[PDB]
Subunit: 249 residues, 4 copies
């Protein structure tokens, strides 16, 4: 069974309290992995424990991935308590509807526009550096999965998207340059960008979304479990997953 | 079991006589699908029948996918003999090492340079049109899988690549515009681009490739079976699969 | 004056009878270049001669760029009559509104769908090979300009676009691989992709286009003259030019 | 003369003390524009004044574009002293050679890896928001030019590039989403991404670069003056400029 090498290993999943990240934590735990689920608000993560049917576990830890200090505190706690990080899932992300500028009367705040870059692009850079330092310390070839977006690969028509696409284009380039760097030094850690179209979560992408095709969080988690299950010599660089009949925004 | 809806259905796989396409035909047949494997030379396809362990089958038919007449003859035979096409796998493709021009003393022939476009880009356009006409005639939402390349998404450094990358950039755009068109008319047929890095097959990509990481044909077929297995409401638009430590050419 | 090195040289411009190509021929001739304008119908090209104010000229020749034989006959006539090709402008192209398939009741003919690939992608491959063979025979570092499209860089939402975007994605990859090949062999011929948004020409992109921002043919020709004017050591790989306030289709 | 509408207007150019930005400031001033050149170290900007031959001017101001407070102080000084910002050139940027991780023994510091995102991506977001607020306050349709990179459009092979490509992919997406937003609200401000290959400046891209083709700073400034010169109804969305025979890293 391809998930056997992962039973009993440790996965860190950012954005674990809601949405895609909450579904990844349950599917990993059901596969026998010990998950450390992190978010700024941990109450909902604690509650996922009642859905674990398999032999893995879910542990909640508080962390704002935009803050280098908070990320270092979480990785130090993991190292002290669980040991090696075997899987890193950079799933936390935000989206604020409105404009870069006020030409449409919907400019987002400067705090929000900076936050979208810090969480969606800086967050995965900082977490990937801590995860890989743990993996290489432990002589272990693990797997980094970055939850990207179709908007990391095309420019949305909607003018509500501000710098969200910019952050995900950032993450496309980051993901590829990280895998490039590992490969150039003959290191066997895997990196995958998983890019969803619309998913029903707590992220409001379109307020008027009730009639639009939308994936479930489990559909995305299912795709993440497939890419972790692939053999140690096989990378899935990119897996773009969208609901059928989607019309991108 | 997610492959249950596919048992007993018909898949057409171009480039079935060798490489990735031969591995797709065996993995589909082992999953209970009746495969029609096509290539310009059918002897090796006939031989794959001895590897079928499951309840599906493999039938060889001769076809040059660059020829509209040959493609129409094969689709007419399928319609007359097996009925609806449920899965279409556009896997046939070629690569000729050398240049567009003679500036390096390795210009490829005009026949070869035209052939690479006709097989790798026209072939999937013609086969997808026949497959979708069959699916919609039969009121069936099937799945089109196009075997692309990492070189459909970046420009190779090697000057041996001529218009191969152009043909695969063509196929990236084709694949996305086809799924766009189906979605815009609320049609639920799925389309996937699967983009491999180096795979050990009969295609000579690099003559000096013995030390390079390379996927096996089964690794690619495994990824094709995963995308066909996904639920009817879930598209995998793109699945890029590469051997670990690959340094793209 | 940066256009001085070009006065008295020979430019070949495909699609010269209408639209962007007719405007390129007049702007080149006004700059002192001797233009050979080609299209399937030459009457309108003959008429551009009355607009030449400068010291260059415009000569009409009949050629269907999708046909290897017609392209070879035109290049042989040029070689026999004018000598070296110094500038090649691959501007001819077509667009047929409607679908790859009939799911929307607007499927384009198989002849048309094959023609779009043959003219828009094969045509520039064949012309570039003849132009570069002429340049290198003559020990001259000339300039290849390919008229691409914004749709060579993103997938249109409109389902009227069929394989047009595929052909222009093809041309993006072709253009880059050609410049890659020249550079890898230390050859100094320049290659530029010029990618327009909507331009008012004889190509019907949107039937309901009267209120949409649209470039004029001269705006595009102006950009082509800028890229030819750049110094021999400076490449403009890509110049994307769009009317202000455009909303891509 | 197409630069007439710009004589006497105000341009802000970040990264003015060296390299491409210093060359842009002199070429703009020679065209009659009043330039405000900004960088963290202003001494070299003061010195460019002796190269102004035309009727424009160069004024030095200190600003770290990664700091929202420093950017707001500079824009407030400009508003108080010169008035409307007519042209914004986001040219400041950094590159630190080495890795995201330490797998190759060349990991860059966490301060540096965060700085590359803050300067190269946050900087242009903050400056563009202040510039556009000034333009729209003044009812003026100006021009935003972002100095990107070929590495904002492909993933470098070199493992010395860390998150530099990520930052420039960020800037590609930012630039396009900004122009998207302006167009969607029928605003006529122009946005251009100018993407150079190697340029000889104070940025060390390759330590062993003496034999590589390299643009001069003036070549890039020349391309920036061309895109500002284009008519008010014509956008140059992207202008990629590279030295001839370049082999991208
Ligand atoms: N249609 C879609 O929903 C869609 C489409 C494609 C891609 N995505 C991507 O999917 C990923 C998951 O989002 P989702 O759709 O599941 O949205 P969601 O339901 O809002 O979940 C976002 C999760 O991230 C956490 N988070 C946000 N900022 C954080 C930070 N600074 N530090 C730590 N945790 C943080 C949130 O919890 P806290 O607020 O408590 O910290 C929450 O757990 C994101 O990267 C998103 O861009 C979503
Ligand atoms: N490293 C790699 O091998 C690699 C990497 C990424 C992508 N790919 C893609 O993988 C696909 C499969 O190629 P492969 O690597 O498995 O190579 P392969 O072993 O050479 O197989 C190519 C198959 O296509 C058939 N074929 C070629 N031209 C055809 C035509 N005109 N009509 C019908 N069949 C045709 C060949 O048989 P006949 O000659 O008998 O017709 C053979 O069955 C291609 O699209 C290729 O571009 C391969
Ligand atoms: N909005 C736009 O118009 C737009 C946008 C972006 C890109 N483009 C690109 O701009 C280029 C020029 O088109 P246009 O807009 O100027 O359209 P146009 O007015 O229709 O001109 C097309 C020209 O190409 C010629 N042509 C077509 N097929 C040919 C072939 N097989 N052999 C030789 N000549 C051929 C046509 O003449 P014959 O029919 O007599 O041969 C005509 O001279 C095309 O590559 C197009 O894709 C146009
Ligand atoms: N091969 C190349 O050189 C090349 C290739 C393509 C793209 N680019 C892009 O070209 C642009 C210009 O760089 P260059 O090559 O001319 O390099 P350069 O000679 O090092 O100039 C960089 C300029 O940016 C300023 N700067 C850096 N960080 C800043 C910050 N936080 N705040 C304000 N100013 C800042 C620097 O001055 P201070 O340190 O005093 O602040 C200097 O004036 C960059 O965006 C770069 O990515 C360069
Ligand atoms: Na991977
Ligand atoms: Na799909
Ligand atoms: Na060029
Ligand atoms: Na512009």
């Amino acid at each position: 069974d391809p998930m056997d090498r992962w039973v009993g290993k440790t996965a860190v999943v950012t954005g674990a309290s809601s949405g895609i990240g909450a579904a990844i934590c349950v599917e990993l735990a059901n596969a026998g992995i010990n998950v450390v689920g992190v978010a700024r608000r941990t109450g909902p993560i604690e509650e996922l424990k009642t859905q674990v049917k398999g032999k893995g576990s879910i542990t909640a830890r508080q962390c704002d991935v935009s803050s280098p200090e908070a990320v270092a505190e979480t990785f130090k706690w993991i190292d002290d308590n669980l040991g090696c990080v075997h899987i890193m899932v950079n799933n936390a992300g935000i989206f604020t509807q409105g404009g870069i500028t006020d030409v449409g009367g919907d400019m987002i705040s400067e705090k929000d526009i900076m936050s979208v870059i810090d969480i969606n692009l800086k967050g995965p850079i900082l977490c990937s550096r801590h995860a890989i330092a743990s993996m290489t310390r432990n002589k272990f070839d693990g797997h980094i999965v970055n939850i990207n977006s179709i908007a990391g690969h095309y420019v949305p028509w909607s003018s509500k998207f501000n710098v969200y696409a910019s952050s995900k284009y950032g993450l496309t380039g980051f993901s590829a340059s990280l895998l490039n760097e590992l490969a150039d030094h003959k290191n066997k850690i895997k990196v995958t960008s998983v890019s969803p179209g619309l998913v029903r979560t707590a992220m409001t992408v379109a307020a008027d979304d009730s009639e639009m095709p939308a994936l479930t969080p489990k559909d995305v988690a299912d795709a993440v479990l497939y890419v972790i299950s692939t053999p140690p010599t096989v990378n899935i660089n990119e897996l773009t997953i969208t609901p059928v009949t989607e019309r991108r925004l």
